[PDB]
Subunit: 175 residues, 4 copies
Amino acid sequence: SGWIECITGSMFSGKSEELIRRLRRGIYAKQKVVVFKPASHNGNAIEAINISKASEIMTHDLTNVDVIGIDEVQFFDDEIVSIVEKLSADGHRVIVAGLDMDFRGEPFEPMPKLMAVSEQVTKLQAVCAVCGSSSSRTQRLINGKPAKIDDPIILVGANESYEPRCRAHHIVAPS
Amino acid sequence: SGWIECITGSMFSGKSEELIRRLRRGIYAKQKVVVFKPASHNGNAIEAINISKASEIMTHDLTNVDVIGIDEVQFFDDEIVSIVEKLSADGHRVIVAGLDMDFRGEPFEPMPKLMAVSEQVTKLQAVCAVCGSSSSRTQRLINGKPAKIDDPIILVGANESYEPRCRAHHIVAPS
Amino acid sequence: SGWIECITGSMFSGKSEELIRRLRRGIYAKQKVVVFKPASHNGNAIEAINISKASEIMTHDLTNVDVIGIDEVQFFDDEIVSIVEKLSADGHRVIVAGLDMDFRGEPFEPMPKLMAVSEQVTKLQAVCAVCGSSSSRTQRLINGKPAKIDDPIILVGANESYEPRCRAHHIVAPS
Amino acid sequence: SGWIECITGSMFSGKSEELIRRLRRGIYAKQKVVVFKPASHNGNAIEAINISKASEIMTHDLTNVDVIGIDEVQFFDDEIVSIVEKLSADGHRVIVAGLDMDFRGEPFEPMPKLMAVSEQVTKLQAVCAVCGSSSSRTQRLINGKPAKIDDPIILVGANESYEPRCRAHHIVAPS
Ligand SMILES: [Zn+2]
Ligand SMILES: [Zn+2]
Ligand SMILES: [Zn+2]
Ligand SMILES: [Zn+2]
C-alpha cells in the first residue's frame, strides 16, 4: 500500500535537497519517480513536472508511477491535502516538502494538516546566522531591520533579505 | 532560551511513555520538571498536575520550572497553542504530547498548529494488530465492525474497542 | 523477514525505557514479546527472562516469539552479535539496548559492531547536570572529583557517583 | 564546544548527499565549512579538499574553520577516529559519512568506533531493488550471480554490479 512522508522546516533547512535525496533512492531501486514543483541512473531518471495549480497533478497519468514528490507545498492551498491522501490511498509513496512557518512565525497552510495526516514527519532545522545554534525560524529583514508583523510579502524597491535564525534571535517588529 | 518539542502519533504509539522518558532526563540533570495532564531521583521528582482547562496552566507559579510537559494535548482547544508559545518564549523547555488523528483519520485539533510551530516534532508509530507492519491509524470497532464516519464519540451500552492499524487495514465505514 | 534495532546512549539517556516502549507496541499488536536482561494488555504481557550468559538465549524456545528485546547489551561479549544476527535471520524483530561508551568515553563492546550491522540505530542523549544542554557522556566522580583514566570499575569503600554531562563538562583525570 | 555527527548506511542510501546538505546549512549561517574526501551562497562556499591519507587533515590550517566534513570515511583506517576526536575537542562541528557494512554484510572499519563515540548517529536506508521495501544491504553481483564470501574487492575483466537490497533479498554465496 501507499503512505505519505512529510519534510518541513524553515527556508534555509535544505527541505528540497532532502526531498531529492529520498526520490533518488527510488531511482537506484529501479522505481519510476516523479516530482511536482510550482511553476538519472542507468536510464532511470526523476521526471520533474512544473505546475501552477494543485489540480494539475490529477491530469497526469500516474498509474505506473511508484514515488511522487511534491516540493514547496506551501505554494498550494488545502486542495493539495485530499490529492495527497488520494495518491497514497491509490498505493503511491508520496513525499511532500514545504515550509512550516512564514517569516512572522505563523503556520504556513497547508503543512499543519499534512503533518497531522502523514505517516512520517521530518522537521529539519538550519543553523542560526547570528549565533550558530540550531535554528527553526526565518528572519526577514527590510532595509537592515526586522520586518514588521503586517509587512506585505511583495514590495517594490525595498532592500530585503532572509536569513536562518533561532527563536532567541528571531524578531518580528510591532505594527 | 526555550523551545517546544512535539510528540505525536496514534493511540497505541506510546506517546505518553515517550513524554515521561524525556521528562525524566530533566530529573537526572537536577532540573525542576512538571507535567500537566487532563483531569523521582535523589529527592528530585516530576511534579504531576491534573487540570480540566488549559487556562489553569498559567495560574501555577512556573518561574523556577525548567521543563514543562503537557500530555494528551488533544484534550485542550486552540488556547493551548499560545500558552505553549508563551511558555517557550519565557525560556522553558516545553514538551507536548497528543494524538495526530482521530479514529476517522481526521486531524485532531490543536496538534496540527503545534507541529507547525514547534522546534522538534516526533511522530511515533505503533504496530498493526492485523499484519504486524508499522501502523499510523487507530481502528475503532463497534459491535465487531468498523465504526461509521458519523458515529458519535460517546455511546451507551455499545461493545467497542480500539486497536492500532496500518492505513491498509484501517476502515472507516460509510454513513 | 526479521531485522535488528539498536538503542544506545549514555547511562542516563533512558535506553531501557525506550526499549520497553518499543516492546509494548508489540503487545498492543497482539504479538508475543520477550525481553532478556542480565541477572500486560488484554492477557498479553512481555515475558522477561533474566540471564547470566548470552548463550542462554538460544536454550529458550523462541519459535513462536515475534519480538525479542535484549537490555544492557554491554554486559555481554562479542558472542551476542552472532546471536542477534541469527535471531533476525530467523525472522524475529530484535531490539537491543546498551551503552555506547564507558565513563572514560571509550567505546563499550559489543555496541560498535551491533550498531554497524543493525537496520536501525537510535542514539539517545541525556541532559547535562552542569549546564542543561544535551549530553552524550557519563561523568564518574570518586570522592567528589573526576575519576582517573586508569581507575578500576570496582572499588571498596569509595564515595562515588555518576551523572550525565556534555563533552564540554566531561573530565577524565590523568593517570 | 565541538561535537561529532555520524552519517552511515549502505552504498545507495545517499550518505554523501546528506553530508553536503548538512554542510550547506553552515554556509547559509555564514560559517566557514570544509569537506575532506578521498583522492556557494553570497561569496561563502564549501572548500573541498581531496586527500589520500587521514594524516593530511592535520597539515591544513583549520583554526578558522567552523564545520569540517569528511566523506567516505571507510576509505581511511582507525587513525581517523583520534583525528575526529581531536577536531571535535578543538571546538569544531565534525560531520563524518561512510559505509556501515561491506557487500558481505561485514562491518566496515572504522565506522563502528566512530558511531560509538559520536554525539549523533544517523543510519540512512535505501530502497530494495528487488521488492521496493527499505533496504540496509548492498548486493554485489558478479557475472549475474551473488558474489561469494571470499571474492576479492578488485577483479580483472569481470562483469559486476551493485544494487541496494533488503536483508531478505541480500545473498552472500558460499566459498
Ligand atoms: Zn541564534
Ligand atoms: Zn496492517
Ligand atoms: Zn554541560
Ligand atoms: Zn527486498
